Inverse folding.
């Protein structure tokens, strides 16, 4: 297919050092995953970058979602438009270790991926969410059964994830 340049980790998990925004713009996947919070406030990290690329359309849509449905749960998700990036955006809430949220909910977060055949995704709970990215990758591999293309922005982290993989 249209995903190019990925390293194969397992039958179904692939990884690349790339900016998820640029990779979504190039591939136009059916599903891109956002590293959301429960309020769908897309201020920083992956979420802030994805929202900026939609010219704030993602935030306007998300505010309407919250006004109608209320917050998500940690570990939960919702499917909204992908705007100019993808057909759909799967907004998934991983635990934020800096807020004291239970890291076990990371498995529940990744289970949402199994409802979609192919996804372009970041590592959940990494970056500003405070979890160890090596652990997040392990939970991903052990939980997701569908085809997941992981984009890791930081080259030094990418190299560490690949070279420590087991």
């Amino acid at each position: 297919n249209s995903f190019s340049g990925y390293l194969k980790l397992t039958d179904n998990v692939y990884i690349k050092n790339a900016d998820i925004v640029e990779e979504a713009k190039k591939v136009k996947p059916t599903v891109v995953v956002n590293a959301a919070n429960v309020y769908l406030k897309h201020g920083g990290g992956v979420a802030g970058a994805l929202n900026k690329a939609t010219n704030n359309a993602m935030q306007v849509e998300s505010d309407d979602y919250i006004a109608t449905n209320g917050p998500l749960k940690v570990g939960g998700s919702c499917v909204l438009s992908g705007h100019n990036l993808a057909k759909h955006c799967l907004h998934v809430v991983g635990p934020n270790v800096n807020k004291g949220e239970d890291i076990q909910l990371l498995k529940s977060a990744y289970e949402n991926f199994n409802q979609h055949e192919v996804l372009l995704a970041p590592l959940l709970s990494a970056g500003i969410f405070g979890a160890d990215p090596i652990h997040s990758l392990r939970v991903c591999v052990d939980t997701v059964r569908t085809n997941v293309y992981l984009a890791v922005f930081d080259k030094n982290l990418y190299d560490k994830l690949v070279s420590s993989f087991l």
